[PDB]
Write a protein that binds this DNA or RNA. Structure first.
Ligand code: K
Ligand code: MG
Ligand code: MG
Ligand code: MG
Ligand code: MG
Ligand code: ZN
Lengths: 55, 136, 131, 102, 74, 142
RNA sequence: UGUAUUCAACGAGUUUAUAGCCUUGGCCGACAGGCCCGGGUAAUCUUUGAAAUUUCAUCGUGAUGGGGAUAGAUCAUUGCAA
């Protein structure tokens, strides 16, 4: 589309400005500590990341 | 006999009376119209609330010598009712604290701490100690 | 001359003075929200809309209302200069027609183009009760 | 030519961190240097609690995920060259070593 | 039920009744005076203060939420 | 002073509003529409009335003083932000409206909103909430 | 309700760009908020870090100083837009 129109809406904040770094989904993003992973992807990769279940 | 050896309530009353008798305090014109904080529903009941607050703040500075306006806002804050929503902590008026600190400084009771906040002066220590001694 | 029973006024200012008043002085009479909106600065679209309204007013034949100016700007704030203009306001489906009156200044164009149809209730269907 | 060299050690494994601290302390002692520490800072426990289900169905069950970071501080009173030589000893993976002055 | 028509200010009969019998009560509290003399709690507190000033009663124990007073002499 | 004086009044009238004589002045004045505990407190302070007295104890001149204080807040140094009618729509003046004046102002606001077909005015006309509250589950009376 | 009084724990915090996150201190303001020096990538700074409660007064059985739904006027902050 026209440069001034195509993708012209600001995306400086809100759920639409962030996505999962693993799958790109914009929902249920864990922003704590800079993980920037969705809860499903984080639960899949927790052991590799270094998070352990003690209780 | 010092302030630590007397009840805080009695010392606060005595020092508020002493401050009022001194005549060096310059109450702002809005003392009779403002609440002590956004969390309050009504203005202070006691007409001498300004002097009591000044005495309490002077005692606090005497005990600890690094307090600022925000610290006093926290000290005199409390729960805020929100109608049908639960209560949460709320700060008190900062203008009252700033004015009281400036007035106390004008009387040489406190000064500026090099690390920030306010500190009790030797004259302030002497005055508070004498007031506590005379309480008995 | 004409005698008006209820002469329009805004914060003790007559209608004639409002038009001649500048934006800086006019903003002080507005409430907090329009004042903040103006202080932050209007974008190109509201300026284009006011220019279009001006042009429509100029081309209006004497003693006749101006043509219709249609826009999507539901967040535009009505200023005294727009009094008497005919504006079509998009509500998401259609451009609703209104005429700007002196009493609507400092309001949003959304406030005069309802985006929903008021509800008139029919008889409850299956599954309304016995919950 | 004497300075208080500050060594900060951070790791997720307690055993490796403790062994590295002991090795550094013994190396400093072997050179007749003055060693203060190691000082154990309070453990940092990063915590994430996320729902087990990838959807919204079933009893709401939660996983408590913790990542523990252990930090140690060692102070040496000596020159930069000797501390640099001491820190050159082999360090196992997962232990970060930072050397600074004051 | 019928609302209690407590009086916020004393009348002469009730004030005299107070000064006569109140010093002879084993237990004196604002609630007791309010129930007996049919007075408001504030008026009861003021009357208790007045009696204490007159010396006809003594303070067994004073608290913000409870004031206990009794006759000065048996 | 504990004994009621012969001039004690059980009921008094102010702006066609019945004021209880047994209640304290600060909270007795609150019976007037447009006057609350805060405004009553400041008005009593500005009129030099003793707050420890009941409504019936005082004299009529003191009620007149209270009413002039209420009717002229600016003259007595009451700030603008403390008034219930700030920056009036038509006059642009700051004042404390009370009694039937408050109802007149409320009616004027509602009718002005309704006349221009403002959304808030339409919601008021239809008898629905005007401050964005959900209406599916609460506010059920008819 | 209005004073006076004073006891936690688990945690979280910055791109430095004039400055972005947690923010002390000073000044302005009734509040909401604003301005200026600065600290902290942290057991280093926010953090000198709560309320219920304790204490003394007002209220006095009255939908009452209980309750805070609904609504009017008006002032700020976030945001491109309330
Ligand atoms: K409803
Ligand atoms: Mg009222
Ligand atoms: Mg503490
Ligand atoms: Mg009530
Ligand atoms: Mg209440
Ligand atoms: Zn993902």
């Amino acid at each position: 589309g026209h440069s001034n129109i195509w993708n012209a809406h600001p995306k400086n904040y809100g759920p639409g400005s962030r996505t999962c770094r693993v799958c790109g989904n914009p929902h249920a993003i864990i922003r704590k500590y800079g993980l920037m992973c969705c809860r499903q992807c984080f639960r899949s990769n927790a052991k590799e990341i270094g998070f352990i279940k003690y209780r | 006999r010092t302030v630590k050896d007397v009840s805080p309530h009695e010392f606060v009353k005595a020092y508020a009376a002493h401050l009022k008798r001194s005549g060096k305090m310059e109450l702002p014109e809005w003392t009779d119209i403002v609440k002590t904080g956004k969390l309050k529903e009504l203005a202070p009941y006691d007409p001498d609330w300004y002097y009591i607050r000044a005495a309490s703040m002077a005692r606090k500075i005497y005990l600890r010598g690094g307090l600022g306006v925000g610290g006093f806002r926290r000290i005199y804050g409390g729960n805020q009712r929100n109608g049908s929503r639960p209560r949460h902590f709320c700060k008190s008026s900062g203008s009252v604290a700033r004015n009281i600190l400036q007035q106390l400084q004008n009387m040489n009771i406190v000064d500026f701490d090099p690390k920030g906040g306010r500190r009790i002066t030797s004259n302030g220590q002497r005055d508070l100690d004498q007031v506590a001694g005379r309480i008995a | 001359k004409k005698r008006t029973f209820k002469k329009f006024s805004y914060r003790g200012v007559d209608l004639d003075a409002l038009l001649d008043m500048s934006t800086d002085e006019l903003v002080k009479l507005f409430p907090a929200r329009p004042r903040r909106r103006f202080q932050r600065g209007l974008k190109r679209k509201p300026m284009a809309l006011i220019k279009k309204l001006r042009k429509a007013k100029r081309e209006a034949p004497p003693g006749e209302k101006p043509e219709v100016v249609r826009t999507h700007l539901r967040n535009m704030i009505i200023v005294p200069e727009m009094i008497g203009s005919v504006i079509g306001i998009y509500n998401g489906k259609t451009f609703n027609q209104i005429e700007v009156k002196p009493e609507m200044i400092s309001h949003y164009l959304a406030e005069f183009s309802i985006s929903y149809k008021p509800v008139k209730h029919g008889r409850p269907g299956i599954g309304a009760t016995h919950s | 030519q004497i300075h208080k060299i500050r060594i900060t050690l951070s790791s997720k494994n307690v055993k490796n961190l403790e062994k590295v601290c002991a090795d550094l302390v013994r190396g400093a002692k072997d050179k007749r240097l003055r060693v203060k520490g190691p000082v154990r800072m309070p453990t940092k426990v990063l915590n994430i609690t996320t729902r087990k289900s990838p959807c919204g169905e079933g009893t709401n069950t939660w996983d408590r995920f913790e990542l523990r970071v252990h930090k140690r501080v060692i102070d040496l009173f000596s020159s930069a060259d000797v501390v640099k030589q001491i820190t050159s000893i082999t360090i196992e993976p997962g232990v970060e070593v930072e050397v600074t002055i004051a | 039920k019928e609302k209690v028509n407590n009086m916020v200010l004393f009348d002469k009969a009730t004030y005299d009744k107070l000064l006569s019998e109140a010093p002879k009560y084993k237990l004196i509290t604002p609630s007791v005076l309010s129930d007996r003399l049919r007075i408001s709690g504030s008026l009861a507190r003021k009357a208790i203060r007045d009696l204490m000033a007159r010396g006809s009663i003594r303070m067994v124990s004073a608290h913000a939420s409870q004031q206990i007073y009794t006759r000065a002499t048996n | 002073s504990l004994v009621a004086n012969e001039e004690f009044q059980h009921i008094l009238r102010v702006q066609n509003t019945n004021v209880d004589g047994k209640q304290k002045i600060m909270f007795a004045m609150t019976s007037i529409k447009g006057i609350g505990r805060r405004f009553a407190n400041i008005a009593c302070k500005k009129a030099d009335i003793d707050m420890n007295k009941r409504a019936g104890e005082l004299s009529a001149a003191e009620l007149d003083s209270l009413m002039v204080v209420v009717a002229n807040p600016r003259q007595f140094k009451i700030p603008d932000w403390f008034l219930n009618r700030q920056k009036d729509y038509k006059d642009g003046k700051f004042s404390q409206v009370t009694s039937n004046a408050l109802d007149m102002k409320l009616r004027d606001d509602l009718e002005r909103l309704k006349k221009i077909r403002n959304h808030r005015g339409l919601r008021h006309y239809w008898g629905l909430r005007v401050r964005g509250q959900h209406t599916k589950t609460t506010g059920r009376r008819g």
